[PDB]
């Protein structure tokens, strides 16, 4: 067996990029097409697998196994395989044409590096060619770099790793049972995950984890001051040595390891980093097929329907599209991905239907804490908090064990509730004093004109449909301890 050509092809449904966009937009046509012929390209060699288990629950588990197989344990202690499909559900894309009822191949390894757009065809990276009747880009971005290490020398980037795939979570993973000390540069909810599991390694293995990032606390862009610093203080819990309002000036070498200077005087020594400071959406396919990318927000430009030009759609997080509330944007959600992968597939189909969809967010920090968000959340916006002792069923690990699945928007579910009616408080509880080291959930509100635009949620679940309810509204209420009371906060 040796390398070989493949021969020109055709596929009705050409979906470029492997990922949980690209999945659920299989799905979808699959659904609303029963024998449809789908084609996934896809340049990582591994099959579509959704990745928020990589710097969460796949940390939390001893068993050596689960970095081989990928079926990472959920807060519930239930298996779960990180793949959408095993190999068995695809089809090879030499098959396709000749399948009875049609299905969906997937060819990994290969890159769509060419759109031609009027002559409904792309070239992979090894030459050949596709035609296709419809075509979705949902090719996700590439995390961005610290500009720092890149005028840093071979020594620092062979020393740093970007994370997003199943090969980063592993690299990383062999590197914390090899390294004595592991830096994470970002503050934001994935460099904050990414901290608490090596802390959590940590105890084991007693290596030394250091958090750095500009702002004045973990997540300090999108919570209230007070929370932030509350986060951070979590973060420090599991083991980390954070340290906020940091600057990298640059970084090289020193004694072997690496050397990190900050703009405020403050030198970092440690053996490996891992950043988490972003992404840039993936539009190497703008340029051949003359597609618009979003001069202020990044991602390929789309309109009600997630559509670019003709017979090419985009989802995911490369696509900068136009939400319900808030007008142009692009996020990096799950839920997002699924979505918009979901209805791009229809639209595929012939639906012509408009993306109305509020995206959410979630965020673990280990079992014990949990975020999710919808919305505008922006820590410059005037902000109305609400809190609350919490219950036992106020976590992630009861969230998990209640649905029984750890993707928090899949047991949020996609409805907006059909109706606010604020209920009636809750029966009082004997207790003692009440002090703010005491509560441990809560709504914070985000406001723009005394009109609610925005909601970050702290341990409280399976109420995201009431918060898309109350965002869609609009209206300006007059007392925001009342409203709390929809979120169970008393
Ligand atoms: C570690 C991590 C944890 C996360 N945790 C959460 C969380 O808990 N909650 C939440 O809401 N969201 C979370 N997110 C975000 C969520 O996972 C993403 O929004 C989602 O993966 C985007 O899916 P996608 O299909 O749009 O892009 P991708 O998942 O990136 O898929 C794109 C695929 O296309 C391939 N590709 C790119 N270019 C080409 C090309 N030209 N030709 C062929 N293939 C190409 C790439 O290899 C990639 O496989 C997390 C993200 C990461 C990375």
Redesign the pocket.
């Known amino acids: 067996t040796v390398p070989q050509i493949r021969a020109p092809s055709h596929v009705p449904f050409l979906l470029?990029?492997?990922?949980?966009?690209?999945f659920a937009a299989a799905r979808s046509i699959r659904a609303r097409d029963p024998g449809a012929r789908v084609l996934i390209?896809?340049?990582?060699p591994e099959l579509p697998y959704m990745?928020?288990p990589?710097?969460?629950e796949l940390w939390f588990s001893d068993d050596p196994n689960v970095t081989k197989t990928l079926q990472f344990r959920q807060w519930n202690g239930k298996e779960r395989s990180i793949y959408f499909q095993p190999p068995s559900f695809y089809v090879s894309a030499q098959d396709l044409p000749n399948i009875e009822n049609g299905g969906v191949a997937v060819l990994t390894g290969k890159?769509?590096?060419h759109l031609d757009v009027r002559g409904n065809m792309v070239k992979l990276n090894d030459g050949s060619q596709i035609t296709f009747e419809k075509c979705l880009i949902?090719?996700?971005?590439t995390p961005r770099s610290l500009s720092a290490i890149d005028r840093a020398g071979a020594e620092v980037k062979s020393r740093t790793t970007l994370?997003?795939k199943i090969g980063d979570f592993r690299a990383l993973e062999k590197i914390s049972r090899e390294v004595k000390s592991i830096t994470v540069i970002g503050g934001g909810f994935?460099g904050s995950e990414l901290a608490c599991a090596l802390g959590r390694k940590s105890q084991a293995s007693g290596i030394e984890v250091i958090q750095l990032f500009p702002e004045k606390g973990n997540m300090g862009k999108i919570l209230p001051q007070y929370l932030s610093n509350w986060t951070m203080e979590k973060v420090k819990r599991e083991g980390v040595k954070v340290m906020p309002n940091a600057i990298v000036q640059s970084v090289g070498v020193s004694g072997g390891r690496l050397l990190i200077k900050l703009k405020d005087g403050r030198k970092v020594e440690t053996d490996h980093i891992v950043t988490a400071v972003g992404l840039e959406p993936?539009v190497?396919?703008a340029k051949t097929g003359g597609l618009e990318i979003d001069s202020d927000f990044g991602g390929f430009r789309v309109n009600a329907e997630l559509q670019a030009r003709s017979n090419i759609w985009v989802?995911?997080?490369?696509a900068c599209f136009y939400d319900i509330k808030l007008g142009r944007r692009r996020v990096?959600?799950?839920?997002?991905?699924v979505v918009s992968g979901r209805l791009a597939g229809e639209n595929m189909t012939g639906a012509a239907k408009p993306y109305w969809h509020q995206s959410m967010?979630?965020?673990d920090l280990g079992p014990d804490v949990g975020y999710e968000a919808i919305g505008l959340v922006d820590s410059s916006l005037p902000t109305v908090g609400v809190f609350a002792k919490a219950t036992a069923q106020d976590n992630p690990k009861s969230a998990t064990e209640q649905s029984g699945t750890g993707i928090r928007?899949e047991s949020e579910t996609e409805s907006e509730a059909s109706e606010i009616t604020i209920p009636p408080s809750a029966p009082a509880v004997p207790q003692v004093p009440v002090e703010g080291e005491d509560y441990g959930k809560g709504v914070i509100f985000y406001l723009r004109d005394k009109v609610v635009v925005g909601i970050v949620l702290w341990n409280v679940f399976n109420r995201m449909p009431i918060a898309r309810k109350i965002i869609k509204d609009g209206e300006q209420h007059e007392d925001l301890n009342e409203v709390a009371k929809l979120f169970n906060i008393h």
């Open positions: 470029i990029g492997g990922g949980t966009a690209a390209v896809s340049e990582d990745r928020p990589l710097s969460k890159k769509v590096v949902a090719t996700g971005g994370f997003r994935l993936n190497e396919l989802a995911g997080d490369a990096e959600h799950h839920d997002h991905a967010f979630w965020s928007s």
